[PDB]
Design an enzyme around this catalytic site. Structure first.
Site, PDB file in Angstrom:
ATOM      1  N   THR A 126      -3.619  -5.155  -3.459  1.00 46.37           N
ATOM      2  CA  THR A 126      -2.722  -4.235  -2.738  1.00 46.37           C
ATOM      3  C   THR A 126      -1.517  -4.989  -2.171  1.00 46.37           C
ATOM      4  OG1 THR A 126      -3.756  -4.361  -0.525  1.00 46.37           O
ATOM      5  CG2 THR A 126      -4.709  -2.768  -2.085  1.00 46.37           C
ATOM      6  N   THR A 127      -0.482  -4.247  -1.784  1.00 41.24           N
ATOM      7  CA  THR A 127       0.763  -4.854  -1.307  1.00 41.24           C
ATOM      8  C   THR A 127       0.615  -5.335   0.145  1.00 41.24           C
ATOM      9  OG1 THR A 127       1.950  -3.235  -2.705  1.00 41.24           O
ATOM     10  CG2 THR A 127       3.292  -4.620  -1.241  1.00 41.24           C
TER      11      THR A 127
END
Lengths: 195, 244, 240, 235, 250, 241, 231, 243, 111
Positions: free
Chosen positions: H30-31
């Site tokens: 995920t970012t």
């Protein structure tokens, strides 16, 4: 306190060892054999600290017996004595040293000669015509200096030994309850039952 | 991990052979021939040096024949560097026995321990075996004169006459032919040199391509002597038997 | 330390290194054990591609572990020395702590345990050796013969053989050994052992070794001439 | 090659699954649990007639209240038995009591997965552990080299196991007497064994609260074999 | 993070060859030529200083190294492997000899210790062999002057004269024609320079050639005076100027 | 072919892992240069900051090892910093044990010996870096010593490292043929830095702003790196001649 | 394929296959459900037998008076990890006189599982765990996966056909979360949840295993005739 | 070939393929982002809501080291936790010996050397995380990003994970539009916007926002989580900008 | 020189009836001539209907009780919640005490 004597004569080595085991004000036993057969023609008597004595004797016995099985051969008395000396010489600088003094009487079958070695707990080895450990030597050495001859028979050696035991029974403070006597010669090790 | 790169030096083949031991023996079969012959009054050790240069210093050289103690010597066939590791172990082992028992080590006891070390490298530790075969020549007061051999497997056996290294098959046949039990040392010297002379891969056997040693009771009154032959002494013994 | 798992399971449930160690045993010289009514005899083949041997000093095939127990083997000779040494040390250690020599069953159980440990320890290969262990328990006159193998299994045998062409000599013993009546004497027992080796051995002058163990630490190895008399006698009865 | 503790794509340990194949090659062992006791029986399977069958030891005492039967690479079981005996005696020393059968089994199963790159491979032997304690009564456990154990009313392991287990499914009920269980083990062993069943190639044992773990004599088993043959002929 | 290479990386192949030792010898063959010649009153060891760049100061890279005051070493093969071997060889001369006997080891025994170190790289876990052959020249009271070659296997041989590396086959043949047992040290230096010119291609002067001798004791090189029994090193490295003096009368 | 995966010999006597570590050296695509004055030793290196989001002050391949020794690296930054931390530790330990500051050439030898171990021992890979050590040694004077993944090391009159190293090397060779001397015959370090940048410009054929370069200078008793404005001052002086 | 020989090797797409194969052992395991309200937390587990003669493999293990878990996958690996949790809960009590937070219990399991996925020779754990507990911040439910990933949830399920119960709980979320001060109803919701994962078999008396912990309830397990109430 | 099967092996290019394969695991995650500001740093991360059954606010991903450093990462979450545990040990021993709390550059090299060590041997696996971290020390604010190889640099802004390119582009606009500097409270709002914009690359599952910050003025130089009113204000700012 | 022991005083008393047992102890805790506490209990319920007291040096007493309480906890974990009988508790406490034979707990223990 514990009496161990040895006399080398013409054809044999005779070892005499006291029978008493005393702890405190009680003689716990009066028939104690202070000896181990290391090999068929090698006998070791011992005296010293309680527990240490038998533990050391049996440990040496196991090692010589192990050697005998491995090589199918009997070590000479000189070789066994050197092995025993080295074990004590190691022990003296250990955390807890073996406090054991020994005499090693053997018959060398290759040389056809009796041999008597005296080794103390420090690992001090000497070959002798006659030997003793502890306070016994203070009486027996001078006695043997006078009466011993190098060419004596086994019977003459036993009479010479009776003279030592009589002197110790007269002048020693403690009752050591007599001695077990054993002879080492060309035919091996045997015990004299009536002494 | 590192599993990828492991040769597995201490495993069995499907046939029940040890790969690395077999391949070490193959290595040894290219090394210079060494012969041991046991006579009634002594032992001969003879060995062929492996390719010489005219510029090799011959007198101050040791390649094949090494002294273990005053009563025992060895002839080497294989990697010299590997042999020197084992020789120093054997030299120490002999001195340990002398220190312990105040008697010179019996020959078989020394041989067994060196052979037990070799065995270990074939059963555990994942290392390559020692690429060395020894001929042990020695004397003790139990068995008298004795010849043994050991190889990378750690198996050892006793012999009247034996060869290791190159052309053992041919050498053994020749020794089996001319050896007899009542033989003397001087006869055995002649047999050892004659056998190398016939089995050699060189054109002709010369003094500069040989190492030679005897173990006799030649010193007086039951005292045993080791003679590692000098170059000139090999030259003379080669003339005396009529090889050159 | 070298850690590699050399003895491992394969998809079919075999441990190949243990099975390949059995092949090394199959390559070894034949060894046979036969127990009589009052004795056990251990017979051993010696290959005759080796002339110029010195038989005084060459390692004997039957080894004393204690004065009352003997061990013979088939397989890698160098491997067998390690098992014999460990057994001899345990024999003396047992005398020291129990104040009694080992039973034959106990000594066998120890040797078999050592062999098993080398089949599930990292960095080691199994012993390429099977043993026949024979003797008499302390103060006992019942003969004992046990067999061990690389896997670590052990068992008792009335008679057994191991090594090369052992299946041929086992066949012989299976029909010639009666369980009701074992060989009543040493003579009968030695002869049956020599006969069984004579099926495979190719002759039997320097090729056959015989060792007889009787009760109370009575072990002796026969000489060439003594064995040769059994060989001579068996061949004359055969021509019939 | 590949790691000893490697997972297969199906989520199973290769070496554990391969050791289970070794156990299928082993000789048959059966156990049946009743309210009067637990019976353990094994196929001896001598490889040759010269081998003295009474030296084949595949049923074994752990403590007075716990017995054990094995199948597979039986040499591997020695250190497992050694551990079990020590665990049992040590617990008696620390707690002045008998150790629960389940707790003994759990202790043996803790050894199982202690392998990798600890020992070099899993055990190649399965164990049937039978016993009694005051809390849970008569119990039978099947201990595998996976480290798992199941309690069983009855269980067979070894070469004849899947056939013997299906037979045990029909025959077992919660009111079986000890004598009924003894005959049932003999019956099912005789069905799955290669050679003909007798007192020399099969062995019975039991554990009861009163008398503890006992291996039966060859004379006692022989009479139970004779009693079994007579009862099958009688209808 | 632990070292998992506890197994041998040099093993026997079916034909009996030890692969990694053979391949190490191949690396030595590629290496620059070095030689050694033994005279009656000394020993000379020599090699070409192959410069990696003309901006590099080849004085800072010493191919000929002092091991003890009476022993020197030169090599052919991999330079880094040689450098660490010199470090280990200098240390072992102290730890396993000088700290015990109060004197420096004789040539044959120091050689023996270096050979051991190289043999262990042939058998121990997780290591390759050293990729060098050494020539070790030295003097000691009881053996006199001596010259030894040490190979990647750990084998060593004594030599009257020899060469190793690139053009060793030709250089050995050259030395056979010129060597006699009556050579004085100056005669051996002359022959060393002649032999080396054959294998060198580019410049041939005191800045591209490295040469050292084992000869007479050098009291001037000792650094102190007063003790008659202390003598000074028999090892001496010839200067750039000293080489060029001998190249004129060549 | 597992002889290409670990540091064991190939059939032709080569160590492929060592050779492939040499190729990792150029992975950053940066060229370095080092020269000696009378009083000083100057090292210069290109500085390429491609990402706008980077903090340019933290992007550096020049390291202050000790007060007197500086080190520039050609190779990936993780291996560069690994080598730098070890060199700092080694130089500190030397001073404690032996009572004087570790010389540049001795530190070079030590780091080269460590590199040699990775070429001989299997479990350790070589570091994919070339280390150039610079100082003004109290005995030897201005000094440049350079280490590689093989464990080779040597002293230099001057040196260069990187993808376009040969162009810079010959440029410097041609200057020292002409000048007939071992160094830059110049009094101030400022003009030796100007020489270094000038000859890098000529060899590479590129112009440099203040943020395209990185400069380290070693004088007697200290090594220091220059700021962007120190370099800008230096770039102005070259342009006005 | 070539990158699944051990846990130390990444695949070209950045996957750890040995960890994924360990994950597969959980999927073969018997279904177990976890759910909680604000006052109580409940585990429900379907137990599996070898055959009709065998016992049913116990799925639920007590870690402390206020914490415990259910397992799906390799049972010996659950024994190792539960024993580690028992020690960590115990250390917290003896040294700090503090009941171990259920969140810290998760963090400790994550880090223990992780070390087995980065070193040569080792292997990942082959089991998934559902940890329930009641601590100083109320009721908790955790899901442990042997990759190392631990997750706090209102409800969940792991094992074969766990997707049925997981969907049900996702629908029932608003109902069961407000079953406060009523143990029997929160269990009924968990028993109905696990029923959505059954095929051909139904919940019997020696098949069902339920555990509960809460505000005035120590971690206790129900088997046998004590679960007959909920069938 | 086979050069990619074992860690620490150089390919003929001079590359460690196992490290490059660990980078693929990071790109899959995920970012997460970091923004350096006037007197501090701000960290933010995307938390994918896999199910309704996840408890909101209760699966915290940003981690504190000592009292003054914050760490966030993308990729294998357990690997990140292992790295933070080491970082905590390194920071504890620094404070023990030297008294002062660990400076950020010092701390950065401690993680860097540790991660680099996991590329030196074939018996270990490289880290499957890129870690964005930083805080405030005696010399002011510092932001760092560390990669599987051991490589790290200082950053004005940093981003990693599935939406790294989207986030990087948005970060580069802030650096250009604010040369003088960004305030701490502004950077919190911007961090929310950038995570919401970077969520477009992961838009199947909706997500939960998590922010933290260290600031000399706003948090007194200590690491704190953004919660309640300040979080909802930042969410609303982000919601307004996507529409 | 540092002395690792002290004396915290107090006294305890245990009597057994037919279907019950009592374990009493005073609540005073002292060092030398000073009172540390007028109410510091040293008789504890350890679970499984076992009460225990270890009187003498209070640090050693608290340590022992703490270890035995923990021993009861692990007995449940390892043996399927089985009740620890009083005779089994006694034997377990012997091993706790003798484990420190060469650096003893200076306490008189009663259960």
């Amino acid at each position: 306190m514990d009496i161990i004597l040895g006399i080398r004569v013409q054809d044999s080595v005779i070892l005499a060892s006291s029978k008493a085991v005393t702890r405190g004000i009680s003689v716990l036993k009066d028939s104690d054999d202070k000896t181990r057969q290391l090999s068929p023609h090698t006998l070791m008597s011992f005296a010293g600290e309680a527990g240490d004595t038998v533990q050391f004797a049996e440990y040496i016995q196991a090692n010589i017996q192990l050697y005998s099985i491995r090589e199918d051969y009997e070590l000479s008395p000189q070789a066994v004595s050197s092995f025993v000396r080295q074990e004590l010489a190691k022990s003296i600088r250990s955390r807890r040293p073996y406090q054991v003094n020994v005499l090693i009487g053997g018959y060398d079958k290759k040389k056809n000669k009796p041999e008597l070695y005296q080794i103390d707990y420090l690992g001090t080895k000497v070959e002798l015509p006659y030997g003793a450990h502890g306070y016994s030597g203070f009486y027996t050495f001078s006695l043997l200096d006078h009466h011993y001859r190098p060419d004596m028979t086994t019977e003459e050696g036993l009479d010479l030994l009776k003279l030592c035991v009589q002197e110790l029974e007269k002048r020693m403070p403690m009752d050591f309850k007599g001695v077990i006597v054993k002879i080492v010669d060309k035919d091996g090790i045997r015990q004299v039952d009536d002494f | 991990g590192s599993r990828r790169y492991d040769s597995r030096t201490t495993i069995f083949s499907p046939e029940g052979r040890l790969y690395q031991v077999e391949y070490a023996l193959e290595s040894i079969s290219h090394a210079g021939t060494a012969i041991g012959i046991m006579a009634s009054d002594g032992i001969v050790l003879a060995a062929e040096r492996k390719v010489t240069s005219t510029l090799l210093e011959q007198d101050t050289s040791t390649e094949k024949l090494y002294k273990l103690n005053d009563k025992i010597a060895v002839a080497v066939a294989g990697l010299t560097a590997d042999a020197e590791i084992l020789i120093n172990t054997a030299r120490i082992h002999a001195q340990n026995y002398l220190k312990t028992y105040n008697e010179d080590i019996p020959v078989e006891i020394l041989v067994r321990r060196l052979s037990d070390i070799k065995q270990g490298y074939t059963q555990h530790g994942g290392l390559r075996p020692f690429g060395v075969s020894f001929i042990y020549a020695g004397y003790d007061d139990r068995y008298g004169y004795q010849l043994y051999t050991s190889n990378p497997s750690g198996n050892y056996t006793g012999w009247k006459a034996i060869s290791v290294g190159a052309n053992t098959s041919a050498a053994q046949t020749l020794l089996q032919m001319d050896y007899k039990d009542d033989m003397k040392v001087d006869d055995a010297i002649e047999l050892a040199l004659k056998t190398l002379s016939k089995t050699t891969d060189s054109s002709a056997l010369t003094y500069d391509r040989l190492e030679f040693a005897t173990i006799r009771k030649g010193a007086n009154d039951g005292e045993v002597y080791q003679k590692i032959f000098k170059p000139q002494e090999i030259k003379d013994i080669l003339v005396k038997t009529g090889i050159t | 330390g070298y850690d590699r798992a050399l003895s491992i399971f394969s998809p079919d449930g075999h441990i190949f290194q243990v099975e390949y160690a059995l092949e090394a045993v199959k390559r070894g010289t034949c060894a046979v054990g036969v127990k009589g009514k009052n004795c056990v005899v251990l017979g051993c083949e010696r290959r005759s591609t080796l002339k110029l041997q010195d038989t005084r000093i060459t390692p004997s095939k039957v080894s004393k572990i204690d004065s009352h127990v003997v061990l013979s083997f088939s397989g890698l000779n160098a491997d067998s020395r390690i098992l014999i040494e460990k057994a001899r040390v345990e024999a003396q250690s047992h005398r020291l702590t129990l104040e009694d020599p080992v039973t034959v069953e106990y000594l066998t159980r120890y040797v078999a345990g050592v062999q098993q440990r080398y089949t599930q320890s990292g960095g080691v290969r199994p012993f390429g050796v099977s043993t026949l262990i024979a003797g008499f328990d302390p103060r006992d006159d019942e003969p004992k013969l046990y067999q061990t193998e690389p896997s670590g299994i052990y068992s008792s045998w009335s008679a057994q053989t191991i090594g090369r062409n052992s299946k041929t000599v086992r066949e012989f013993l299976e029909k010639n050994y009666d369980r009701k009546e074992p060989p009543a004497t040493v003579e009968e027992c030695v002869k049956l052992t020599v006969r069984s080796l004579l099926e495979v051995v190719q002759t039997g002058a320097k090729n056959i070794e015989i060792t007889v163990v009787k009760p109370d630490s009575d072990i002796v190895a026969l000489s060439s001439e003594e064995i040769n008399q059994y060989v001579t006698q068996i061949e004359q009865e055969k021509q019939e | 090659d590949r790691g000893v503790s490697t997972f297969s794509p199906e989520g199973r340990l290769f070496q554990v699954e391969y050791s289970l194949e070794a156990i299928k090659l082993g000789s048959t062992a059966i156990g049946i649990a009743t309210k009067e006791g637990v019976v353990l029986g094994v196929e001896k399977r001598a490889t040759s007639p010269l081998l003295e069958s009474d030296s084949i030891e595949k049923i074994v005492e752990i403590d007075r209240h716990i017995g054990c039967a094995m199948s597979g690479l039986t040499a591997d079981a020695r250190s497992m038995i050694e551990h079990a005996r020590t665990a049992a005696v040590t617990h008696n020393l620390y707690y002045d009591e008998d150790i629960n059968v389940e707790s003994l089994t759990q202790s043996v199963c803790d050894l199982a997965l202690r392998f990798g790159e600890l020992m070099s491979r899993p055990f190649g032997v399965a164990l049937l552990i039978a016993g009694h304690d005051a809390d849970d009564g008569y119990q039978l456990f099947h201990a595998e080299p996976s480290g798992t154990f199941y309690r069983y009313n009855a269980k067979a392991i070894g070469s004849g196991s899947e056939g013997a287990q299906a037979e045990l499914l029909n025959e077992w009920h919660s009111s079986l007497t000890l004598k009924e269980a003894e005959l049932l083990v003999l019956k099912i062993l005789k069905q799955v064994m290669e050679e003909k069943l007798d007192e020399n190639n099969a062995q019975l044992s039991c554990i009861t609260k009163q008398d503890g773990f006992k291996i039966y004599d060859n004379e006692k088993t022989a009479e139970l074999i004779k009693e079994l043959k007579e009862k099958e002929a009688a209808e | 993070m632990t070292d998992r290479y506890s197994f041998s990386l040099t093993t026997f192949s079916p034909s009996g060859k030890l692969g990694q030792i053979d391949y190490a010898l191949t690396a030595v063959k590629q290496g620059v030529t070095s030689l050694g010649i033994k005279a009656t009153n000394g020993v000379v060891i020599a090699t070409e200083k192959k410069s990696s760049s003309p901006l590099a100061m080849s004085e800072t890279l010493s191919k000929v190294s002092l091991l003890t005051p009476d022993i020197g070493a030169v090599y052919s093969g991999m330079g880094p492997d040689y450098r660490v071997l010199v470090d280990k060889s200098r240390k072992v001369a102290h730890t396993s000899y000088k700290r015990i006997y109060g004197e420096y080891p004789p040539t044959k025994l120091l050689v023996s210790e270096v050979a051991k170190i190289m043999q262990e790289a042939t058998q121990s876990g997780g290591v390759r062999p050293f990729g060098v052959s050494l020539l070790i020249a030295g003097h000691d009271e009881f053996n006199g002057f001596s010259l030894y070659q040490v190979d990647p296997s750990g084998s060593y041989f004594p030599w009257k004269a020899t060469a190793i590396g690139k053009g060793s086959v030709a250089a050995k043949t050259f030395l056979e024609k010129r060597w006699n047992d009556e050579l004085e040290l100056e005669d051996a230096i002359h022959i060393a320079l002649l032999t080396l010119k054959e294998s060198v291609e580019g410049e041939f002067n005191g800045d591209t050639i490295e040469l050292a001798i084992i000869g007479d004791e050098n009291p001037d090189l000792l650094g102190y005076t007063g003790i008659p029994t202390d003598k000074g090193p028999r090892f001496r490295k010839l200067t750039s100027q000293e080489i060029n003096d001998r190249l004129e009368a060549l | 072919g597992y002889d290409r995966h670990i540091t064991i010999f190939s059939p032709e006597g080569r160590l492929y892992q060592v050779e492939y570590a040499f190729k990792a050296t150029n992975q950053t695509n940066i060229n370095s240069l080092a020269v000696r004055g009378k009083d000083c030793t100057v090292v210069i290196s290109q500085k390429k900051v491609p990402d706008k989001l980077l903090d340019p002050t933290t992007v550096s391949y020049i390291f202050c090892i000790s007060r007197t020794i500086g080190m520039v690296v050609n190779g990936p930054i993780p291996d560069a910093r690994n080598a730098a931390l070890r060199a700092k530790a080694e130089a500190a330990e030397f001073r404690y044990k032996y009572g004087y500051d570790m010389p540049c050439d001795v530190l070079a030898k030590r780091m080269a010996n460590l590199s040699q171990i990775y070429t001989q021992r299997a479990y350790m890979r070589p570091l994919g870096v070339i280390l150039t050590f610079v100082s003004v040694d109290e005995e030897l004077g201005p000094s440049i010593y350079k280490t590689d993944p093989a464990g080779y090391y040597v002293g230099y009159k001057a040196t260069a490292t990187g993808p376009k190293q040969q162009e810079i090397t010959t440029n410097l060779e041609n200057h020292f043929k002409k000048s007939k001397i071992d160094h830059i015959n110049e009094e101030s370090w400022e003009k030796v830095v100007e020489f270094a940048i000038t000859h890098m410009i000529d060899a590479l054929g590129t112009e440099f702003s203040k943020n395209d370069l990185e400069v380290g200078v070693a004088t007697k008793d200290k090594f220091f790196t220059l700021s962007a404005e120190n370099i800008e001052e230096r770039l102005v002086a070259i342009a006005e001649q | 394929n070539n990158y699944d020989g051990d846990t130390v090797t990444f695949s070209p797409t950045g996957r750890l296959f040995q960890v994924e194969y360990a994950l597969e052992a959980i999927k073969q395991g018997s279904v177990t459900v976890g759910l909680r309200s604000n006052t109580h937390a409940v585990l429900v587990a379907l137990k599996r037998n070898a055959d009709e003669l065998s016992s049913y493999q116990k799925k639920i293990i007590k870690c402390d008076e206020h914490m415990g878990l259910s397992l799906a996958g390799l049972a010996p690996d659950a024994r190792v990890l539960s024993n580690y949790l028992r020690q960590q809960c115990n250390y917290s009590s003896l040294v700090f006189n503090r009941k171990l937070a259920v969140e810290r219990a998760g963090h400790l399991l994550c880090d223990k599982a992780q070390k087995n996925t980065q070193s040569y020779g080792g292997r990942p754990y082959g089991v998934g765990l559902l940890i329930i507990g009641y601590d100083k911040s109320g009721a908790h439910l955790l899901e442990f996966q042997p990759s190392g990933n631990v997750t706090e949830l209102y409800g969940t399920a792991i094992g074969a056909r766990s997707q049925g119960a997981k969907t049900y709980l996702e629908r029932t979320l608003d109902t069961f979360i407000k079953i406060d001060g009523n143990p029997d109803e929160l269990i009924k919701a968990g028993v109905e949840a696990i029923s959505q994962s059954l095929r051909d078999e139904s919940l019997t008396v020696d098949n069902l295993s339920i555990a509960i912990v809460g505000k005035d309830t120590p971690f206790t397990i129900y088997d046998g005739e004590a679960v007959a109430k909920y069938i | 070939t086979g050069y990619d099967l074992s860690n620490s092996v150089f390919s003929p290019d001079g590359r460690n393929f196992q490290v490059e394969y660990a980078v693929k695991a990071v790109e899959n995650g995920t970012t997460s982002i970091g923004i350096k500001c006037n007197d501090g740093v701000v960290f933010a991360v995307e938390k994918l809501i896999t199910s309704k059954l996840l408890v909101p606010q209760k699966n915290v991903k940003i981690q504190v080291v000592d009292r003054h450093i914050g760490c966030v990462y993308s990729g294998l979450i357990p690997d990140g936790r292992h790295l933070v545990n080491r970082g905590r040990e390194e920071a504890a021993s620094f404070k023990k010996l030297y008294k002062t709390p660990i400076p950020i550059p010092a701390f950065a090299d401690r993680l860097g050397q540790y991660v680099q060590a996991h590329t030196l041997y074939n018996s270990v696996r490289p880290f499957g995380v890129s870690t964005i971290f930083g805080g405030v020390d005696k010399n002011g604010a510092h932001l760092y990003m560390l990669e599987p190889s051991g490589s790290y640099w200082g950053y004005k802004g940093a981003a990693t994970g599935k939406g790294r390119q989207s986030a990087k582009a948005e970060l580069e606009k802030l650096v250009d539009h604010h040369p003088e500097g960004l305030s701490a409270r502004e950077a919190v709002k911007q961090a929310a916007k950038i995570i919401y914009l970077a969520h477009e690359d992961n838009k199947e599952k909706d997500f939960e926002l998590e922010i933290s910050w260290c600031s000399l003025s706003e948090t007194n130089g200590l690491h704190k989580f953004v919660k309640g009113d300040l979080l909802q204000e930042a969410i609303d700012f982000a919601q307004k900008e996507i529409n | 020189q540092f002395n690792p022991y002290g004396d915290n005083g107090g006294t305890i008393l245990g009597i057994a009836g037919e279907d019950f047992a009592v374990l009493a102890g005073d609540t005073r805790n002292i060092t030398d001539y000073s009172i540390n506490s007028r109410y510091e209990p040293k008789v504890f319920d350890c679970g499984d209907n076992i009460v225990m007291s270890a009187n003498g040096f209070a640090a050693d007493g608290d340590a022992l009780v703490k270890r035995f309480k923990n021993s009861v906890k692990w007995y449940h974990f390892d043996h399927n919640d089985k009740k620890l009988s009083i005779n089994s508790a006694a034997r377990n406490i012997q091993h706790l005490l003798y484990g420190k034979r060469f650096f003893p707990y200076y306490v008189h223990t009663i259960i």
